[PDB]
Write an enzyme that holds these catalytic residues in place. Structure first.
Site, short mmCIF file in Angstrom:
data_model
loop_
_atom_site.label_atom_id
_atom_site.label_comp_id
_atom_site.label_asym_id
_atom_site.label_seq_id
_atom_site.Cartn_x
_atom_site.Cartn_y
_atom_site.Cartn_z
N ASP B 27 9.28 20.80 46.10
CA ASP B 27 9.42 21.55 44.86
C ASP B 27 10.77 21.12 44.22
O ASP B 27 10.80 20.70 43.04
CB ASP B 27 9.11 23.04 45.12
CG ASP B 27 7.76 23.37 45.80
OD1 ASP B 27 7.15 22.49 46.44
OD2 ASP B 27 7.33 24.52 45.71
N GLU B 50 8.12 16.07 58.08
CA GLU B 50 9.58 16.08 57.98
C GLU B 50 10.24 15.77 59.32
O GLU B 50 11.23 15.04 59.36
CB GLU B 50 10.12 17.44 57.52
CG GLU B 50 10.02 17.63 56.03
CD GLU B 50 8.65 18.07 55.57
OE1 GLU B 50 7.85 18.47 56.44
OE2 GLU B 50 8.39 18.03 54.34
N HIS B 107 13.31 32.81 43.51
CA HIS B 107 12.63 31.58 43.98
C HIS B 107 12.62 31.55 45.51
O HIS B 107 11.77 30.85 46.08
CB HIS B 107 13.32 30.32 43.41
CG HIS B 107 12.53 29.58 42.39
ND1 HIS B 107 11.39 28.85 42.72
CD2 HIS B 107 12.70 29.42 41.06
CE1 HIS B 107 10.90 28.28 41.63
NE2 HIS B 107 11.68 28.63 40.60
N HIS B 108 13.55 32.29 46.14
CA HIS B 108 13.79 32.33 47.61
C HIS B 108 12.48 32.45 48.40
O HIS B 108 11.75 33.44 48.25
CB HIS B 108 14.75 33.47 48.00
CG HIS B 108 15.15 33.45 49.44
ND1 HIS B 108 15.06 32.30 50.22
CD2 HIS B 108 15.67 34.41 50.24
CE1 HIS B 108 15.49 32.56 51.44
NE2 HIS B 108 15.87 33.85 51.48
N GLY B 406 16.46 14.28 74.74
CA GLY B 406 15.19 14.18 75.49
C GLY B 406 14.03 14.87 74.82
O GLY B 406 13.31 15.54 75.50
N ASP B 437 1.08 8.62 76.80
CA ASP B 437 -0.13 9.13 76.18
C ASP B 437 0.11 10.52 75.55
O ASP B 437 -0.56 10.91 74.56
CB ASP B 437 -1.30 9.18 77.17
CG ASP B 437 -1.07 9.84 78.53
OD1 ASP B 437 0.09 10.13 78.89
OD2 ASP B 437 -2.08 10.02 79.24
N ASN B 464 -1.73 7.54 81.25
CA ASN B 464 -1.73 8.02 82.64
C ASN B 464 -2.30 9.44 82.70
O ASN B 464 -1.79 10.32 83.42
CB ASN B 464 -0.33 7.90 83.24
CG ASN B 464 0.72 8.70 82.50
OD1 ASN B 464 0.44 9.42 81.53
ND2 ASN B 464 1.96 8.57 82.94
N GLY B 466 -2.11 12.18 81.23
CA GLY B 466 -1.32 13.41 81.13
C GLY B 466 0.18 13.19 81.22
O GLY B 466 0.69 12.04 81.21
N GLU B 470 6.28 15.33 84.25
CA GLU B 470 6.28 16.77 84.39
C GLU B 470 5.55 17.13 85.70
O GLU B 470 6.03 17.94 86.47
CB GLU B 470 5.66 17.41 83.14
CG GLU B 470 6.25 18.76 82.77
CD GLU B 470 7.58 18.70 82.03
OE1 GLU B 470 8.52 18.01 82.51
OE2 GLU B 470 7.68 19.36 80.98
C1 LIG Z 1 9.49 18.62 71.86
C2 LIG Z 1 9.36 18.66 73.34
N1 LIG Z 1 8.39 19.41 73.86
C3 LIG Z 1 8.25 19.51 75.19
C4 LIG Z 1 9.09 18.84 76.07
C5 LIG Z 1 8.88 18.92 77.58
N2 LIG Z 1 8.34 17.64 78.12
C6 LIG Z 1 9.16 16.75 78.69
S1 LIG Z 1 8.44 15.29 79.29
C7 LIG Z 1 6.91 15.91 78.77
C8 LIG Z 1 5.69 15.05 79.01
C9 LIG Z 1 5.71 13.61 78.42
O1 LIG Z 1 4.38 13.05 78.44
P1 LIG Z 1 4.10 11.47 78.66
O2 LIG Z 1 4.79 10.81 77.49
O3 LIG Z 1 2.66 11.24 79.06
O4 LIG Z 1 5.02 11.13 79.97
P2 LIG Z 1 4.74 10.01 81.12
O5 LIG Z 1 3.30 10.21 81.47
O6 LIG Z 1 5.10 8.61 80.55
O7 LIG Z 1 5.71 10.62 82.07
C10 LIG Z 1 7.04 17.23 78.15
C11 LIG Z 1 5.83 17.94 77.64
C12 LIG Z 1 10.15 18.04 75.45
N3 LIG Z 1 11.04 17.37 76.18
N4 LIG Z 1 10.24 17.98 74.11
C1 LIG Z 2 6.57 20.96 54.78
C2 LIG Z 2 6.39 20.65 53.30
N1 LIG Z 2 6.74 19.45 52.73
C3 LIG Z 2 6.57 19.20 51.40
C4 LIG Z 2 6.01 20.18 50.55
C5 LIG Z 2 5.75 19.96 49.03
N2 LIG Z 2 4.30 19.86 48.68
C6 LIG Z 2 3.58 20.93 48.25
S1 LIG Z 2 1.89 20.70 47.89
C7 LIG Z 2 2.11 19.04 48.32
C8 LIG Z 2 0.86 18.19 48.20
C9 LIG Z 2 -0.20 18.66 49.21
O1 LIG Z 2 -1.19 17.64 49.47
P1 LIG Z 2 -2.79 17.90 49.33
O2 LIG Z 2 -3.16 18.96 50.38
O3 LIG Z 2 -3.47 16.53 49.31
O4 LIG Z 2 -3.05 18.47 47.80
P2 LIG Z 2 -4.41 18.42 46.86
O5 LIG Z 2 -4.61 16.96 46.50
O6 LIG Z 2 -5.64 18.92 47.56
O7 LIG Z 2 -3.89 19.37 45.80
C10 LIG Z 2 3.51 18.73 48.73
C11 LIG Z 2 3.92 17.33 49.14
C12 LIG Z 2 5.65 21.46 51.23
N3 LIG Z 2 5.11 22.50 50.57
N4 LIG Z 2 5.85 21.62 52.55
MG LIG Z 3 1.95 9.77 80.11
#
Ligand SMILES: Cc1ncc(C[n+]2csc(CCOP(=O)(O)OP(=O)(O)O)c2C)c(N)n1
Ligand SMILES: Cc1ncc(C[n+]2csc(CCOP(=O)(O)OP(=O)(O)O)c2C)c(N)n1
Ligand SMILES: [Mg+2]
Ligand SMILES: [Mg+2]
Lengths: 557, 556
Positions: B27, B50, B107-108, B406, B437, B464, B466, B470
Site C-alpha cells: 500500500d 517477505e 490508516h493504522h 540456524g 527435503d 531423507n 523427513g 531432529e
Molecule cells: C524456522 C524454523 N523452524 C523450525 C526449526 C527447527 N528445526 C531445526 S532442523 C529442522 C529439520 C530440518 O529438515 P531437513 O532439512 O530435512 O534436515 P536433514 O534431513 O538434512 O537433517 C527443524 C524443523 C528451525 N530451526 N527453524
Molecule cells: C504480506 C503482504 N505483502 C504485500 C501486500 C500488498 N498487496 C495487497 S493485494 C496485492 C495483490 C494480491 O494478488 P492477487 O491475489 O493476485 O490479486 P487479484 O489479481 O485476484 O486481485 C498485494 C501485492 C499485502 N497486503 N500483504
Molecule cells: Mg532432510
C-alpha cells in the site's frame, strides 16, 4: 495421581474443544509435542512453515472459538509474528505457545542457546507482548497450572492472542491431574447495573428520536457470540440491517430486512445511500470505522452512532467501560420493540439473486462469477476470500443461512487465506465432516503461502481451492502501476500443485467459460466434499467486480 | 537540479554497489518502487513473500557487501522479521526499508493508538532505526543508515513516509560519497593490545588461529593469511567462517565445531593454551546438536568493533588496522615454535561399485571433486550444514552456512540473493546449494523468483523422508519429524520453468555420471538434483554426539 505440565496443557486445550495443534517443532518444544499423542482427540497438524501455521490457527479459532500454535524460541516465534498481528487486529483467540530453553541456574542454559548475541533472552517475549492481550513465561511449577488456565481464559474471553512461554525443563515437571476435574472458568463478569441501565436508556432515547435508522454487524458480532441477539434486534425493530465485509455471515441473509454489505465507497449506490443517509447507526461488534485501504474508504455520515463491543459500549463520543456487548444487547431486547414503535418499514436494497442465462462459450468475468457462486453455496458452508478482487467480489454474493465468512479485510495479509483454509478445514472436519470449506484466492496471493496445500493433502482434508488466474496482482494494478514489473508474477501450473505436493486422491480442473463453470458446479459428484479439489478460474488481466472499477476513473486522476 | 527522495535513496544504493532490491510491493511503498526503473543498473527482484525476501537480502549482502529490502507498514515488515533477526545475529548489513503512511491524522492496520509499534519491534534487532519526518534532514539520515549498515554489518531499520518519498532534493548531494572509512585507532589502546598479545604468543606452548564469520564480513581475510604464514600455528575455521581461510594452505587443519569436531581437530583445539580468534560471532554458545567453547581462558578475540583478551574489552581497537601491527612484530615474537602437524579429512573416496547406495559421509567427501575456485557453497541447517565441514573447498570458495541463528528455509532465499550478487560479480561463478527435503518446504516458492530472473543455481535437495537431524536428537519415529512427500523433480516445471534440468541420484555411480559430466559443470541453466538418502543417515561425527549427549544424566 500426577501428569506432566506438557500433558496438563493439552488436556486443558481439549476441554475447550481445541483438538488440532499448529506449528513446527524445534530445538525446545520436542518433549512438549510428545504429550499430544497421549491425549485421545488431539493431533499435530505439522505445518510447512510458522507463518502459514499462524494463519491456520487464525482460521481454526474463527470457527471453533480459539486455537493453539506452538513454535520454538527465536527462529519459530518470530516467523509467526505477522500471523499473530493480524489475529490481534481482527480479534481472534490464538494461544501462541513458545518452547524456550531451561530456566536453569544463572539462566546459563537460556543464555548459551540464545544466539541473537545481545545477551537479552527476553527480547522475543517483549516483541510478542506488543501484539498479545497478555503474556506469561512460566518459571514456577506451583503457579503454572493456574497461569496456563489464565492464558487460555484470556484467549477465549477477550478473543485476542496470548503469548505463553514454556521452558523445556518445566513441561516435564508434574502436577496433580485432580486439577483438571475443575473446568477453566470462561464466564463473563456481569455488567455494572449503573452503566448498563444508563447505556440502555441513552440508546432507547436515540432510537425514539430517529427517523431513518440502520443496523450494522461487524467481525466481533460473530466472534463474541451475539448472532442471535443481533437477529432479535433486527426482528424487534424491523430496522434495515447490513454487514461489513468482515462480519459477512453474522446476519442470516435470507432475512427480509437484510440489505446487503456496506463497503463504504465501494458499496452499491442503493446500499451506499441506505447507510449514508441513516440518522442513527447501530454497530454490533464494530471493528473500528473511519478507516482507509488503498482501494476503499469506510465511515458513516451521521455522528449519531452506537457501537456495541465486547469490552464496552460507545454512544456518539461517550464511552462506557465494562458494558458488555452480549448482556447489553440482551437487556436492550426488553424495551427496544417499544422504543421502535413508530418506525415505518421502508423496503431495502437487494442484489440480483441470479445471472441471466448466456451462451456456454461466454468468457468468464468477475461480476458474473461473484453472482453465480450464490447458486453453488449451501447452508453450513465456510467461504474464505483473499484480499484482492475476491475480497470485494464476494460482497455481492447471496449467502445461504448459517454460512461463515473469512475475509481478513482490516489487516490485509495476502496469502493469509491458504493457511486460514487449512485451519477452517480442520475445524469443519471436527464440527461436521459434511461441512464444505470453499476458498477464493488470486494466483498472486497464492504464491506467498502456497506450501500449506501440502498440509491439507497430508490430512486428506477436502477444501475447494478456487484459484483466480488473472496474470498478476490485478487490484494493486487498478490503483497505481497498471503495467509495472512489481505487480507481475511468474506463471505457475496450478493444476500440477496438488500432485507435486504428493496428492494421490484429488481433482484439478480449469474453467474459462460460463458453461465450463456451470458443468463443474452443478455436477452432484463435485458438490459433495469427497476429495480435495482445485479449480483454476481463468479471468481477464484487468478484470474486477463492477463497483471497484467504479473507482479506477471516478477517484483516480 | 532536483530528484525525488525516492530516487536519491536508489542512487545512493547504486553508489555502494547494491543493484538488486528485495521485498514486496505494498500500500505505502509503491511510489518508492517506481524510482527503481529510472536508476539504470538497478532491479526489483519481485520476491514471492517477505520472509523469503529478507533471507535473499541476507544472501546478497553476504556476497556484495550490503543489501536492501523494502517492505510495507505492518503486514510487510513483520513478515520479514525472522530474516532481519538472523541477519542481526550472524552480522550482515541488511538495510530494512519500510514504506509507511504519510503524517496521517486511522490508516493504522493494528487497533491501539500506536503508529509506532512495528518500529519499536524492529529496534530490538537493528543497529539503529530512523523514521524520517522532515525532507531537510532525510538525505543526511539515509546516509547514516547506509553507512551504519555497511560499517557495522548489522541490519538497520529505515522508515520512509509516503509523502516525503515524492518530495524532492538536490542531485548535487550525490557528488559527495558517503563516508565508508574507519579512522585509525587511538594509538594508546592499540599498543597496549598489540603488546600483551605478542607477549602471550611467546608464552604460548601451543597456540591456534580461529577464523569466524566476521573475518570475511569485515575484510580481514588477507591479514589472517599472512599471520598464519608467519606464526605457522595450526589454523582453523568455525562452520560460520568456512572459506575465510583458503583450505589449500599447508597449516589449515579443518573446521572446529566444539563437541562435534573430528577427534583429531577436537584434540588440536581443546589443548591449545592460546586461541587467536579473528572475527568471532560467539565464543561459547550451544545448539540442539552441539556445544561450542574453548578450553583455555587465554583467548584473543579481534572484532571490527573492538579487541578483547581473556576478560579485558578494549573498545576502540579495530580488527583490520590492529592486525597489521601484529603482522610485523609477530614474525619475531613467535619464532620459537616447533610446527605441530595439522589434521586432515579424507581428500578422496575409495573406489566402489556404481550400484553402492548413496551415504552422507561419502557425499561430502565427493562434493570436493565437483567444486572449483570462485564457487559459492550454501548449506542449510540440518545434516547438510554439518556434512560440508568434511568437504575440501578449492581456494576462493565463499561459504554460507547459517549455523549460529540456524533458521531452516533460510537457504532457498539466501540462494536467490547470492545468485543475483554472483551474476553482478561474474557470469561464470556458480552457486551451489544443499538443502533438506524438509527445510525447503518452508521457503519453496522463492524458486519461482530464481526462474523468473533466469538465474542458474544448483539445487541439491537431500531427500531423507523427513527432518533427520531432529530425529537424531529426540523423536526418531515421531509424526512431528515426518513431512508430506513432494515430487521434488516436478517443482521446477510446476513453477513455470522452461530452461531447466531436474535429475534424481540414488547411487554413488549416478552421482558420478552427473557431476563429472562436462555440461553439468557449466552454469548454463537452473538444475535441481534430488539426492536420495537413508532416513537416519548423517555425517558420522553427528551420529556419535547425538548418542553421547543422550547417554549422560546432564541436562538443559
Ligand atoms: C524456522 C524454523 N523452524 C523450525 C526449526 C527447527 N528445526 C531445526 S532442523 C529442522 C529439520 C530440518 O529438515 P531437513 O532439512 O530435512 O534436515 P536433514 O534431513 O538434512 O537433517 C527443524 C524443523 C528451525 N530451526 N527453524
Ligand atoms: C504480506 C503482504 N505483502 C504485500 C501486500 C500488498 N498487496 C495487497 S493485494 C496485492 C495483490 C494480491 O494478488 P492477487 O491475489 O493476485 O490479486 P487479484 O489479481 O485476484 O486481485 C498485494 C501485492 C499485502 N497486503 N500483504
Ligand atoms: Mg532432510
Ligand atoms: Mg491475480
Amino acid at each position: 495421581s500426577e501428569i506432566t505440565l506438557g500433558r496438563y496443557l493439552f488436556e486443558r486445550l481439549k476441554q475447550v474443544e481445541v483438538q488440532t495443534i499448529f506449528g513446527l517443532p524445534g530445538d525446545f518444544n520436542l518433549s512438549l509435542l510428545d504429550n499430544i499423542y497421549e491425549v485421545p482427540g488431539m493431533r499435530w497438524a505439522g505445518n510447512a512453515n510458522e507463518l502459514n501455521a499462524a494463519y491456520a490457527a487464525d482460521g481454526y479459532a474463527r470457527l471453533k472459538g480459539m486455537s493453539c500454535i506452538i513454535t520454538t524460541f527465536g527462529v519459530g516465534e518470530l516467523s509467526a509474528l505477522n500471523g499473530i498481528a493480524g489475529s490481534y487486529a481482527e480479534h481472534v483467540g490464538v494461544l501462541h505457545v513458545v518452547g524456550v530453553p531451561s530456566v536453569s541456574s544463572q539462566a546459563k542454559q537460556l543464555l548459551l542457546h540464545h544466539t541473537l548475541g545481545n545477551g537479552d533472552f527476553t527480547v522475543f517475549h517483549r516483541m510478542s507482548s506488543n501484539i498479545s492481550e497478555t503474556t506469561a513465561m512460566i518459571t514456577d511449577i506451583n503457579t503454572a497450572p493456574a497461569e496456563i488456565d489464565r492464558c487460555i481464559r484470556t484467549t477465549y474471553v477477550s478473543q485476542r492472542p496470548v503469548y505463553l512461554g514454556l521452558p523445556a525443563n518445566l513441561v516435564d515437571l508434574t502436577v496433580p491431574a485432580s486439577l483438571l476435574d475443575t473446568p477453566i472458568d470462561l464466564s463473563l463478569k456481569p455488567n455494572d447495573p449503573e452503566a448498563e441501565e444508563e447505556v440502555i436508556e441513552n440508546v432507547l432515547q436515540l432510537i425514539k428520536e430517529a427517523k431513518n435508522p440502520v443496523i450494522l454487524a461487524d467481525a466481533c458480532c460473530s466472534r463474541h457470540d451475539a448472532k442471535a441477539e443481533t437477529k432479535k434486534l433486527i426482528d424487534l425493530t424491523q430496522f434495515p440491517a447490513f454487514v461489513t465485509p468482515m462480519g459477512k455471515g453474522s446476519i442470516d441473509e435470507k432475512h427480509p430486512r437484510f440489505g446487503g454489505v456496506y463497503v463504504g465507497t465501494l458499496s452499491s449506490p442503493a446500499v451506499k445511500e441506505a447507510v449514508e443517509s441513516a440518522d442513527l447507526v447501530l454497530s454490533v461488534g464494530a471493528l473500528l470505522s473511519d478507516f482507509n485501504t488503498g482501494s476503499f474508504s469506510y465511515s458513516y455520515k451521521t455522528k449519531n452512532i452506537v457501537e456495541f463491543h465486547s469490552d464496552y459500549t460507545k454512544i456518539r463520543s461517550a464511552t462506557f467501560p465494562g458494558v458488555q456487548m452480549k448482556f447489553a444487547l440482551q437487556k436492550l431486547l426488553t424495551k427496544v420493540a417499544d422504543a421502535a414503535k413508530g418506525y415505518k418499514p421502508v423496503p431495502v436494497p437487494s442484489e440480483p439473486e441470479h445471472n441471466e442465462a448466456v451462451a456456454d462459450s461466454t468468457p468468464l468475468k468477475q461480476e458474473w462469477v461473484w453472482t453465480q457462486v450464490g447458486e453453488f453455496l449451501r447452508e453450513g458452508d465456510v467461504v474464505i476470500t483473499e484480499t484482492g478482487t475476491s475480497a470485494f467480489g464476494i460482497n455481492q454474493t447471496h449467502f445461504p443461512n448459517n454460512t461463515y465468512g473469512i475475509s481478513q479485510v482490516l489487516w490485509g495479509s495476502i496469502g493469509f487465506t491458504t493457511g486460514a483454509t487449512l485451519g477452517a478445514a480442520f475445524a469443519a472436519e471436527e464440527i461436521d465432516p459434511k461441512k464444505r470449506v470453499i476458498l477464493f484466492i488470486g494466483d498472486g496471493s497464492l504464491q506467498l503461502t502456497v506450501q500449506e496445500i501440502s498440509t491439507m493433502i497430508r490430512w486428506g482434508l477436502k477444501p475447494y481451492l478456487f484459484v483466480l488466474n488473472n496474470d498478476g496482482y490485478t487490484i494493486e494494478r487498478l490503483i497505481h502501476g497498471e503495467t509495472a514489473q512489481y505487480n507481475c508474477i511468474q506463471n505457475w501450473q496450478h493444476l500440477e500443485l496438488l500432485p507435486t505436493f504428493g496428492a494421490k486422491d484429488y481433482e484439478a480442473v480449469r474453467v474459462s467459460t460460463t458453461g465450463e463453470w456451470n458443468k463443474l458446479t452443478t455436477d452432484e459428484k463435485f458438490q459433495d466434499n469427497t476429495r480435495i479439489r482445485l479449480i483454476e478460474v481463468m479471468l481477464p488481466t484487468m478484470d474486477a467486480p463492477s463497483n471497484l472499477v467504479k473507482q479506477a476513473q471516478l477517484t483516480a486522476a
